[PDB]
Design a protein around this ligand. Structure first.
Ligand code: ZN
Ligand code: ZN
Ligand code: ZN
Ligand code: ZN
Ligand code: ZN
Ligand code: ZN
Ligand code: ZN
Ligand code: ZN
Lengths: 312, 340, 316, 327
């Protein structure tokens, strides 16, 4: 089979709880940029089951599935308490284990799969990464009907998904902020109750009016920047939670007395566990959260994409 | 009655004794704790602009004493009862008051801050529900609990501890530190590591109940923490009275999902690389005071003897300015309590 | 002013002519525009109207303001008031129960903090929320729902049922199964947002649930105005770790085999009213249109006895 | 090797550990009332014969992929292991798995000289405790630790432990004392039991044979009642009496399998927001918690009586009328 690695290799044979998948969709995201041994990339997997190991239960050849790529070894503290995404020595498909940048891919254990019924491989693949990430980020915001949330860059891919999830799972008031009329509009279509265009308005001033000067109870900053970190924490209400997600090389700078006086919290997040995967997939399969705007490409265009869902 | 008040140093005035009406309670002060917060008060910063403070005002937010007279609406308390008081009282209408976090009230009634406090012979408690009847503790032992006790109790709760976790208490040999160690020992089951910089402070942390203690002046603290936790790091850090140094050092001891609980008002900034926060799911959380639930918790622990009173130094009401000076010039080791 | 009051147990309410209280301090005098009436029934615990006058200590409210009121107010000193669960206060001040209510032209609200400024809703639309809204909002929270769970609402086509369906739909992301006992009630459950619906008087509820949940059962059941029948049937639909939230006051007992409880880690939990946080939540949702007002029937204050005889909203 | 299976003593072969499996040389096999019931097919899909013993502790004889463990290590084992695909396994509640692998129940247990642990992650290296002290913790320890967590205790609350002087009761008292800060009231029916509850750490003890327990509980709690009751091995009597001691919002944590029904007036439940919650076993988090406590000496081992592997049936008989078998 073909395989873009960090070639023409052989097709692994599934044994035990393993499952061999015929890749129908291999998502690509900025994380693949940080990657670029040998190792096949592709941590956003979706496809049809080609063959299952003798021990596999509940799945048959032909089944359409999406896969949770981050799998813990089980013995460490994080695996034991149920936070395997924070495993000390994880098995990460497309990162430290061969991924979906190929015609076929092996899933260590069948429990990490999710049978697709409503979505197709292309619509699901991105959910195994951005979906899990965003779903956990909303969970960390600790929202309820009495609260108001601010989603930064609400008109982007991650932003609209965050708005959709928050609207489908919390009942909180949602304020989306972006910088272009188009994005602001995308944020509104995602379900934001209020939208702000930082390019035509002072977001803080607008947020202060919307919340009657209280500020927001949570901010979800997906793919934060030095700019966002210096601006949006100012919008936090007392006890507000600033949920940061991403890997940009920037530092958090905040006056300590402001944190203690207002009991604010800065919380980080990046990926997610089986519970997060189950949640986003149930939502997507129910249509409560729509698939990301996607652009399909060929497997050979992998490098191009990195320079988007690849279809073997 | 006599009363030391902030008029613009504090001045000893001779004002009248308020008469309790309705739910109000008149208390004959037996103990008036003094802490660094009173230094901020005397400096003005932190009050008139934001806290609605209107000079002159009797300071003293750490109250304990005997009930002198009660309002006709007061229920469950009688003259002669010995009580401690929760000084932070919400107005009720704001969001924080509605969700039960009145200490974060938009316009609180704060005894000793924007309402007359205990630096006097008598003090009025707006509503009797803010008191706690003492049975085991005396006024002197209880007064500091209304401030440092509530604060530390809440900080421990924010650490989200459980039997599978390990906590690090920074400056574990100090007043606040030993209190945090004791509370964590009594309410969580977590492994407790105390760190300080002096042999006597380190020993005090041990006596407070710490499972492990570290003298950061002798051993590299981070390396010892890694050894004790077998490279995992700690699940929480409680940094009471944080400094520029502690904030730059201890967050590095955090395990994945670790929570760094900062308490205090020192003029310093938190500086941390964002990718480190997201990769490890760490959290930086602030705390300063506490609500009725926090007060209820610390008083129950103290009354049961599960948490010991702070090392105290009793002084007279007229020595209020002196007590506060000892705090400005950091020459006041030991909780100073005024006995009117 | 006019005011229908309970002058004698067993006997009917009497329309007396008492004086209009004068608001002092934090108190607020409301010109009643809507006085809800429910089975729980100067009475009137479902209050909504315009502010007539405010006490000298009132802040944030002015005469003319349209407001809804949380009738259950704690004394503050007891354990429950201290931890923020004042609805379970040991000696509460309950408007319309042990304190004069809204069955009159004017009513005094002990403290302004218990009010909520109406901006989208009118008095009639809001009054019911101060009771059924709070109750249902808290019941949904106790169900501990999330997107991977499924909720069963019993009697989902009724007034409380449709409200519970709407709230669960607007705040949880959970799959919702609604069941009731007559077609009009069933169709109403669908309109309320239930993903699946069932008529228990026409078919066996337990088999359908099994099918829908693919034999897992439901993660939570909210049994509004439970009965001897519901309690003997629906707990059987619970999945492992399922929570059975019972709401109501009917004279019936809960009877369940203990081993079934331990083996599945199920929980039976009761709920009846709610606190300031629940009131804040339901008002926020209603004012935002995320949950619609109850179907109401307006009547006159004089018809109090009549209404109790038979959502009916009295209007002075 | 010898092995008492479903009881008969057989002479079967010693399995060979492959992959993540671990072969343990059993040094302690706890026995509890659950084995009375064992001695399940149509349900748990039990394929007879099967070696009992779900309370495992011993030395690692051989490791299969195994990482972090070596031959000679002393370990205790979490016997309840989920298959992974079901809802409960996915959300981290594998003890409630739809099709679990349960050592000593539907998989060969410790009633033998050797036993296979499917995956090494279910073990816990012993440092302070010996095999005999640890074995019971894999069952009663996990169970009681989870029951205490379900009580939702905190320093502002008070807990009542029923039968506080028994094996499970003192365990519950000790765990609650070490992990919550709640005030603890232990109740029992004999002077000696009441005494055991006190030594366990109870702040207050009640001899229900001398004083009316509900009355004493009200006096202690100043008429509020308790915020939680942990009723380990409940009976028809406990369920009819103690729920009356619950304060508003109180949680009645029931644990056990006795054939009794819960009977309570609904209005009482709704008016007080009380909760009846069941529990029986526990997950990896529960195992980690109880073992950390025990290994730190914060919770003491159960009073134990060691016996021979061949006395398995006798041990179970004794229950029908903490015993640990030593191969
Ligand atoms: Zn990705
Ligand atoms: Zn791991
Ligand atoms: Zn102080
Ligand atoms: Zn307030
Ligand atoms: Zn009503
Ligand atoms: Zn109360
Ligand atoms: Zn057992
Ligand atoms: Zn399972």
């Amino acid at each position: 089979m073909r395989a873009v690695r960090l070639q023409e290799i052989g097709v692994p044979k599934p044994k035990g709880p393993q499952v061999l998948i015929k890749v129908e969709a291999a998502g690509v995201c900025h994380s693949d940029v940080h990657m670029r041994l040998p190792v096949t990339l592709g941590h956003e997997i979706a496809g049809k089951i080609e063959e299952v190991g003798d021990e596999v239960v509940g799945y048959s050849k032909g089944d359409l599935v999406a896969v949770n790529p981050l799998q813990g070894e089980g013995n460490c503290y994080y695996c034991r308490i149920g936070e395997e995404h924070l495993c000390d020595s994880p098995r990460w498909l497309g990162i430290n284990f061969d991924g979906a940048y190929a015609e076929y891919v092996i899933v260590p254990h069948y429990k990490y799969m999710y049978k697709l019924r409503r979505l197709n491989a292309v619509e699901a693949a991105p959910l195994t990464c951005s979906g899990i990430t965003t779903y956990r980020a909303v969970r960390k915001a600790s929202l309820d009907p009495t609260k108001t949330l601010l989603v930064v860059g609400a008109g982007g891919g991650l932003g609209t998904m965050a708005v959709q999830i928050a609207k489908a799972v919390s009942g909180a008031t949602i304020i989306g902020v972006d910088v272009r009329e188009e994005a602001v509009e995308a944020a509104k279509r995602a379900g934001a109750d209020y939208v702000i265009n930082a390019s035509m308005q002072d977001p803080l001033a607008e947020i202060r009016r919307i919340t009657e000067s209280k500020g927001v109870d949570a901010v979800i900053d997906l793919n934060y920047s030095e700019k966002t970190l210096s601006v949006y924490p100012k919008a936090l209400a007392k006890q507000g939670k600033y949920v940061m997600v991403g890997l940009f090389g920037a530092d958090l700078h905040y006056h300590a007395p402001l944190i203690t006086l207002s009991e604010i919290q800065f919380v980080g997040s990046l990926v997610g566990n089986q519970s997060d995967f189950l949640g986003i997939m149930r939502l997507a399969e129910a249509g409560k959260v729509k698939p990301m705007i996607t652009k399909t490409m060929k497997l050979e265009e992998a490098n191009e994409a990195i320079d988007q869902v690849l279809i073997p």
